Specification:
heterodimer; A: mainly alpha; Glycosyltransferase; 16 helices; B: mainly alpha; Serine Threonine Protein Phosphatase 5, Tetratricopeptide repeat; about 0% strand; binds ligand TIN; binds alpha-hydroxyfarnesylphosphonic acid; repeat (chain B); protein farnesyltransferase activity (chain B); acetylation (chain B); enzyme binding (chain B)
Chain lengths: ~400, ~325
């Protein structure tokens, strides 16, 4: 049956060593609700809900894309992301985006774009590399002579150069903070709109490295605990910067891998911390990169079939513990769905279903054959094709 | 003088001190996307914020206006920006400010702008006295708030405040030895103060680490830290480590060990050792238990340590 379900899988439960500390307790409670889910098949189990609410998440996404309740008042200043998650999530699920919204989206983002490069949380807000990423990384999903033109590649570059700091790392926004998160946005963007000068990220690779701590993973800023989100940022930025090898790849792999839960099946952003869907991409997003890393470096051993993580046990979690009855996906069972997770919780499924190291390919689609999503680029988390198109565009300039 | 929660709170249009100005409706274009139906109170505030911001009005009233724009969305970096400004110009009392930000942060600790806004103030006053204690209280609600720890690392570096941190680390360690964040804190206070090259220091830690290992065999932190402070020099450099870890197979087994060994045997296979054939299997063997028994979920990985080790150790 499904790995997660198997009998002897209840060996991978928590042994707290008859000791108890908040971490223990919490991990304990999760293992309960997570178990209850798996065990929840004793009465009927013919064609399990091992289905992916294609249409159900669609309403949530289709609708949420045009209007959001007063609840979303907290995302008031990150509106372009609210576009990015949805547009992406759709592509993953595979719903053509209406060529009429296409404009509106563009027409919207064009309104956030500050006259001084980059984009803003919304109409009339100061430019900031997060939304700016969102916006650009979004415009590219649309990939039309219309989207591509929205971006003022000239100014974007100037903005970037402003956040640019001496030690290499950029600020987030003017007078804002600094952490890998920053560099990744710069890189991700500049590369797409092909606006990189040989003197932009001077030192940046060097900095993103000072981030990799004693745990082999990477942290927000030098000295900070290893964290999956930042890690993805750091590595990805370097896959762009073509510096992967600058880190201790072996000390890194060891970690990521330990990030998967020997029980649940998903990942934990940090050692000794509850599991969490979105990280299904943040963490497991890493291996498809670490693959390109080693292989490039010239390593044999690397498989030719999967990624270095239990792809099944991951899907077996995203599916049995992260989908909402009503729609959209989430953190862990019993947690208010939101377009963020609904995004990265799926991106984290595409990863686990698809493999493409070399000209060869081999998927592993758990659940019903109607659960295969579209591929997702390992570094940008967008159509592996909308990416090729995007670049193969701005380059002609 | 009011608050946004006080019953006697009134919108701004319905106010006198605010009748000599016209609101600025957020233009979302003819055909809006991902639009929010802002509540009356919320939508109102900002219509007024804009009007100010747009008029770069460095007024005392705009200031108060911000506090509210912040309560509605303390995640709005723009509003935070225009705030520091008002602080600059109106030349406001910064402690009067510190008190305000301690509050907010206490309220929404998982925020970015609210923290960075505390750092700004602090570097302005050049006085971190309050910090170490504050952060601590935050850490006493969430012994793992990233921001809290990060803010702390900065406050400790920028102001050379080490002296009494290693105690702190040890303290919270009792509280919850499994706290991976605290473990990272330790290796911050040491690598930056005494370092681990010191024979006594590296000695001291490793010993202790092992302690926490025996006390709680499955604490995946104690182990990552043991492998953590001994991995640079390589493990083959500390022979005894391979025997002690062997006196744990019984009432202390854990896949966290199975691996350390393998790890050890790896570094050994990288340093011309005797029995460059007895270990090479003694370990490839241990990779089995992992992938098929003790740590199967990581089967795919192990089934690579195996391959890798063979791929470079034969004939
Ligand atoms: C237990 C702590 C949980 C932290 N978590 C936030 C959960 C959010 C998800 C969205 C609905 C509300 C709750 C993850 C997280 C961490 C950092 C950022 C992050 O990047 N930080 C900035 C984002 C600025 S977008 C202008 C901040 O100001 O907080 C974000 C993020 C990402 C995109 C949009 C909005 C947010 C909050 C999310
Ligand atoms: C913006 C990105 C590309 C990636 C962000 C990745 C993250 C999920 C970041 C997590 C932030 C941290 C350290 C946690 C905070 O929520 P807290 O300090 O409250 O625990
Ligand atoms: Zn999450």
């Amino acid at each position: 049956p499904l790995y997660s379900l198997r009998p002897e899988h209840a060996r991978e439960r928590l042994q707290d060593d008859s000791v108890e500390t908040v971490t223990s307790i919490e991990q304990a409670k999760v293992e309960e609700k997570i178990q209850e889910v798996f065990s929840s098949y004793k009465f009927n189990h013919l064609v399990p809900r091992l289905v992916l609410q294609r249409e159900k998440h669609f309403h949530y996404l289709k609708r949420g894309l045009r209007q959001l309740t007063d609840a979303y008042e907290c995302l008031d200043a990150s509106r372009p992301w609210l576009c990015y998650w949805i547009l992406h999530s759709l592509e993953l699920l595979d719903e053509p985006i209406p060529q009429i919204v296409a404009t509106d989206v563009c027409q919207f983002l064009e309104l956030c774009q500050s006259p001084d490069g980059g984009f803003g949380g919304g109409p009339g807000q100061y430019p900031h590399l997060a939304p700016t990423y969102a916006a650009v990384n979004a415009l590219c999903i649309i990939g039309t002579e219309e989207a591509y033109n929205v971006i003022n590649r000239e100014k974007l570059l100037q903005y970037l150069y402003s956040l640019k700091q001496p030690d290499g790392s950029f600020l987030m926004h003017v007078g804002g903070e600094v952490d890998v998160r920053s560099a990744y946005c710069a890189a991700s963007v500049a590369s797409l709109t092909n606006i990189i000068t040989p003197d932009l990220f001077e030192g940046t690779a060097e900095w993103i490295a000072r981030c990799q701590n004693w745990e082999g993973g990477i942290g927000g800023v030098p000295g900070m605990e290893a964290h999956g989100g930042y890690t993805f940022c750091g590595l990805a930025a370097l896959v762009i910067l073509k510096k992967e090898r600058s880190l201790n790849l072996k000390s890194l792999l060891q970690w990521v891998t330990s990030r998967q839960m020997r029980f649940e099946g998903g990942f934990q952003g940090r050692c000794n911390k509850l599991v969490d869907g979105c990280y299904s991409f943040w963490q497991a997003g890493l291996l498809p990169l670490l693959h390109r890393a080693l292989h490039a470096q010239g390593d044999p051993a690397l498989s030719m079939s999967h990624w270095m993580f239990h792809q099944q046990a991951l899907q077996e979690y995203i599916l049995m513990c992260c989908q909402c009855p009503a729609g959209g996906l989430l953190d862990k069972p019993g947690k208010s769905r939101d377009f963020y997770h609904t995004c990265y919780c799926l991106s984290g499924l595409s990863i686990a279903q698809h493999f493409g190291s070399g000209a060869m390919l081999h998927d592993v689609v758990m659940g019903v054959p109607e659960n295969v999503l579209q591929p997702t680029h390992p570094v940008y988390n967008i159509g592996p094709d909308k990416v090729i198109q995007a670049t193969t565009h701005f380059l002609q300039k | 003088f009011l608050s946004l929660d006080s019953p006697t709170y009134v919108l701004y249009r319905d106010r006198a001190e605010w009748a000599d100005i016209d609101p600025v409706p957020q233009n979302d274009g003819p055909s809006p996307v991902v639009q929010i139906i802002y509540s009356e109170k919320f939508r109102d505030v900002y219509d007024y914020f804009r009007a100010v911001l747009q008029r770069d009005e460095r007024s005392e009233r705009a200031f108060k206006l911000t506090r509210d724009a912040i309560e509605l969305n303390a995640a709005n970096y723009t509003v935070w920006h225009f705030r520091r400004v008002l602080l600059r110009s109106l030349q406001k009392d910064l402690q009067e400010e510190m008190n305000y930000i301690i509050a907010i942060i206490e309220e929404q600790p998982k925020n970015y702008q609210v923290w960075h806004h505390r750092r700004v103030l602090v570097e302005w006053l050049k006085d971190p006295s309050q910090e170490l204690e504050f952060i601590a209280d935050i850490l006493n609600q969430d012994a793992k708030n990233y921001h809290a720890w990060q803010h702390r690392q900065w406050v400790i570096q920028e102001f050379r405040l080490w002296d009494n941190e290693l105690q702190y680390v040890d303290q919270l360690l009792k509280e919850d030895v499994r706290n991976n964040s605290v473990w990272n804190q330790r290796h911050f206070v040491i690598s930056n103060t005494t370092g681990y090259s010191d024979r006594a220091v590296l000695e001291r830690e490793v010993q202790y680490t092992l302690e926490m290992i025996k006390l709680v065999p499955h604490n995946e932190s104690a182990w990552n830290y043991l492998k953590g402070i001994l991995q640079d020099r390589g493990l083959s450099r500390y022979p005894n480590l391979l025997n002690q870890l062997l006196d744990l197979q019984p009432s202390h087994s854990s896949p966290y060990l199975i691996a350390f060994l393998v790890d050890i045997y790896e570094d050994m296979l990288e340093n011309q050792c005797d029995n460059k054939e007895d270990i090479l299997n003694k370990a490839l063997e241990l990779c089995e238990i992992l992938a098929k028994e003790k740590d199967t979920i990581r089967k795919e990985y192990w089934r690579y340590i195996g391959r890798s080790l063979q791929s470079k150790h034969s004939r």
